[PDB]
């Protein structure tokens, strides 16, 4: 259940969904489950170096996460 996830939980989620590249930024900023599910795009933008493509991809992945849940 994502709301239970810690920082490590978020890293692995990012890993198995081919977003390995962003794990370390996510860790450094201590993005655990709770914060994950709170994230807006405005928040996601600087976490990915102000890059729209990755930002949208991550936003989509989280949205999908929120679906089966």
């Amino acid at each position: 259940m994502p709301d239970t996830w810690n920082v490590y939980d978020v890293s692995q989620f990012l890993r198995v969904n081919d977003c390995t590249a962003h794990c370390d930024t996510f860790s450094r900023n201590k993005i655990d489950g709770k914060r994950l599910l709170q994230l807006t795009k405005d928040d996601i933008m600087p976490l990915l170096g102000m890059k729209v493509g990755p930002a949208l991809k991550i936003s989509d992945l989280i949205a999908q996460l929120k679906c089966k849940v």
Partner: protein, 78 residues
Amino acid sequence: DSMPIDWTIEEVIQYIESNDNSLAVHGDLFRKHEIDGKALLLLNSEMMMKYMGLKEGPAEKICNLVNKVNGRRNNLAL
């Protein structure tokens, strides 16, 4: 030559340039933002103008181009 969602960044650029020569200028912009096929289909006018810095004109033209190939996804619009 392929599903839009399977496009590389360069192939996205190729699409936009060959349909509108006026957008060739925005090549490097797409590269910076790493807009491949999947990213392209996920775009919206908001993200374009807010975060990619595109003007109304270009943004509209790009919205149109995406609309031609994004299937039954919602039409992008300003």
